[PDB]
Amino acid sequence: ASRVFIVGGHITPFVGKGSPLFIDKKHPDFGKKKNMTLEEILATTVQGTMEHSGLSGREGIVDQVVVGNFLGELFSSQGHLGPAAIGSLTYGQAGSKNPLMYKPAMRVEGAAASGGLAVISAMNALKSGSADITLAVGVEVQTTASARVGGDYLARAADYQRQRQLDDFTFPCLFAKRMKYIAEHNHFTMEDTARVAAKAYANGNKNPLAHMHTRKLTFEQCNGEDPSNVKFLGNETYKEYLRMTDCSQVSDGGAGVVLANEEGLRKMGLSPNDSRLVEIKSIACAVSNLYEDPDDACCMFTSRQAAQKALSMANIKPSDLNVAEVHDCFTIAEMLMYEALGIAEYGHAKDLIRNGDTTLEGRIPVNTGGGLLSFGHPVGATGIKQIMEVYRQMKGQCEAYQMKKIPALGATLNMGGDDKTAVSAVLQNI
Template sequence: MSRDVVVAGVGMIPFAKPGKHDPYFQMAATATRAALGDAGVAYGQIQQAYVGYVYGDSTSGQRALYEVGMTGIPVVNVNNNCSTGSTALFLARQAIASGAADCVLALGFEQMNPGALGSVFADRPSPFDRFDQATDELVGHGEIPLALRYFGGAGKAHMDEFGTQLSTFAKIRAKASRHAARNPLALFRTEVTEDEVMAAPVMWEGVMTRLMACPPTCGAAAAVLCSDAFAQKHGLSRGVRIKAQAMTTDTPAAFEARDMREVVGFSMARAAAQQVYEAAGVGPADLDVVELHDCFAHNELLSYEALGLCPVGGAEQFVLDGDNTYGGRVVTNPSGGLLSKGHPLGATGLAQCTELVQQLRGTAEARQVEGARLALQHNLGLGGACVVTLYERV
């Protein structure tokens, strides 16, 4: 039988530009100590740890946690591209729900290099070779970095089908900056206007400007999960629980649909969200706050539809009506999202967790979504994996 899983503690550090941060193990240890302190547990009470990072050598998770303690527990290193942090969270939740453990740490960190993402191992086939081939065939533009072609191409497919305006993506980016201005842990806290986003250097004519893409970022975040019985026994906070969670990978539609939206995981995200809604007995209309994977403004717009926040084809109107921010239907990315908070790949999913737990506790200060009770997290990694998590205030 599945047991209730409590999020007892969360912690993260301010995200920073490459070169403006501590070494990865120090960032990770600081975030871990913050989560342990928030939970009110000692590291010696942690029974397992799942540690996510994308750019790092094997057993970097142990190197990071040995800064906190050497207790002999299992430490599992996790790499699932941009959904790495949420995959660590998924595994930690499974360990508790199944009864394998009672108190587990999920940790994510990243020490990134400046510039566009690239492959580390050039002497073997890339895991993205089929994605690259599909992108070449569907959008071309080989002179543009691949990540921009993936998500810019997906945004362009939406523009071509529904007449979505480039200015709508600029509105999403401007909204992210307004939210991040309230977040002391965000990388970019300066507000930008829609006009400033439109006037930024062009990355792909008619499709994307520089401000519509998230920056390479370094940072760390962590969460302590435990069973309800463990929380009761040790007097821990039981106010936030994981109500439902799902993880999906690609289906043949990713390539067979001949649609860049499918290449970047639209159906993968929609399937994960539907599984979560069904398991929890709720629908998207019941959500109060969402942290979703806005690696590009284009993916935020696509994710509104994949998560059911609006109908397919209705995302532009959703933005124009202000339904994605305070005073609208559901507040999306109150943290500032990846676009403004930053995107240290391995840490992102646990930073999203941190934000939503604070929202449900009512401790998000200037970012607080009034009366938040249900919060949805969406974290997607190409190649591919998508994790959707629903948190509940109890």
Template sequence: MGNFAGELFNKQGHLGALVPRVMPELAGVGVGRTEAACASGGIALMSAAEAICAGHDVVLVAGAECQTTVSAREGGEYLARAAHFQDERPIDDFTFPALFARRIKAYHEKYGLPLSDLAHFTMKAMENARKNPLAHMKANKWTFEAAAEGGDHNPQFLGNQELKDYLKVSDCSQVTDGGAALLLCSEEGLKKLGVDKSKAVKLRSYHLATNALGQTEDLTRMDTAGLAFCKTFNDGNVKVDDINVAEVHDCFTIAELLMMEAMGLEEPGKGVEAVKSGKTKLDGSLPVNTGGGLVGFGHPVGATGVKQAAEIYRQMKGLCGDYQIKSQPSLGVMANMGGDDRTCFTALFENMG
């Protein structure tokens, strides 16, 4: 069970023991909680994979977060615990938006990125979300012009005056309540469940990378994500050009841009070209965040990594309805990030049928 901050938002810990309360048939089965900030769901998936390697046949992987129990400012303080609280909390009342505004500022100064270009990521997310009945922003009416400019309709809400001009509401993921679940099985587990291999997706390789809190060396790079992608691609014996669909952690628009560079899809300084060229749209050569991503679908923190894996499964099996991509994907990759690129779990999936 992936969850970041149940004790804070809901005054409830020990979430593993809630599972048999909801599903009494699981009484007596071992259930535990995994936590790695926004990568909590990815860690749950990794833990399940390790359990399969250790001899289990069927493992339930779930993630959940309920964040709308408190005000935005109180929630911002809770989420700031995914950063180095002592050093980074004072940056702004909204710590994580400020940390990623800092990245936008650094990238803008180094590469000359027009700030309005980030609206291309916003619009891809919102257009995909409109096609997804489960998306937080399914009824959104964003336009590129509105997303590209700050103002009363799109506030630049940070209190930190050095960073205020670099981030707008449209650059941010949604504070969302939600959950996701999937089953990870061995071949024997599939037989026990009576599921044909053709209905499954193979977890071909995965990697978890972690770096020190509060010690980002280069704000224009996501080195932890880059390491995780590299290891996962190498272990899976694939290149980025082999990938047909991807789910990456777009907690902010700049995060998706930097993920495009971290995975090797674009050169440093060219990440925005992935979306401007149409490459990562639903009809592009590598659709990214097809259901809306964190910006459009939403970000129920502990569930996000599990949802990313489930989204790739759904694309591979043609279950995505209006946002289904045209060509059936053979290979998909996910990247679930915790904190400001401090933890990153990546996984490569192969369609079995």
């Protein structure tokens, strides 16, 4: 009966407009250097993952690689990222020896759950006899298209035929539509969602990897007291329910993790009690119907299903959790995710955000490094960044945002589209 261990991994800085690392007209190197391409990010990410996992010089003992990516075929005109991953170890050195040659690889995809799906696929290979050491890397580049062209691409997450007509920013508009229903049922408020953003940015300010690291926002600004915090939607039914600060960033970046089973650890010279490890006690995936939406906007049924499956499988309750990473593609989502995960009861995420319970000094800190709101959302990377952020907290590696009490139990909740795909894992510190 075969356990799965996080051995190590790597998260790149997440970059886009508003980051000093993002090269644009404004930037000292505009004209001299360029932002990384997807290929370069995938290269930096696979290499970093191998390095931080003790695999440098022995990359050949990895059995297989899975890539999570949503829109590479659109933003970067590039699909078929498996062989891209296979050429990533020695990218840009012609004819170099390549220990990864001929190993199995593929790209998996389920909108913003694509990294989460890459981890589950790697885990099935670990439990199946196919692999003892797997690499799961997630990468995304989205800064190559205008905001509106980008919006149309991200609508690939939605039921395009049915929902694209709502707004050029289809996917935001779907969360603004939830917020309307949520406000109508007094489930929570736009002040509450502002408090989520306040928290995300304050955390991001302590994370040099975060897209919005350098951006400071007060609750007041996040609540709409700032002329630049615009209600940008075109759809007049939903316009008033979503501010710029309520939305995740359009970022580029990657995250990688090495996952091993007990034979994998043996091959690396490691024991299962090794203090650099974290055990994935469980992982579960739930998918609903792309074509049909539940009436109750105040419940993410699919994400609730995934979390309840993961916790049950690991035999714990949400109150046992010491830390969580959840899918705050909007502030609206973070609130819904506290309830989906079960750290708050239905209609009570608001108590949590009012009382500070999910802040860095709260009793259940969530998205300690900034979340998708401030850390950023390079779509395919996000599912794997969530795992590595729990890992990093457990190993005491988060520096200015390190939790004071090293967490014993953590949970991840990764969602694709409008709660249509959900992946949730339970992690146990070793």
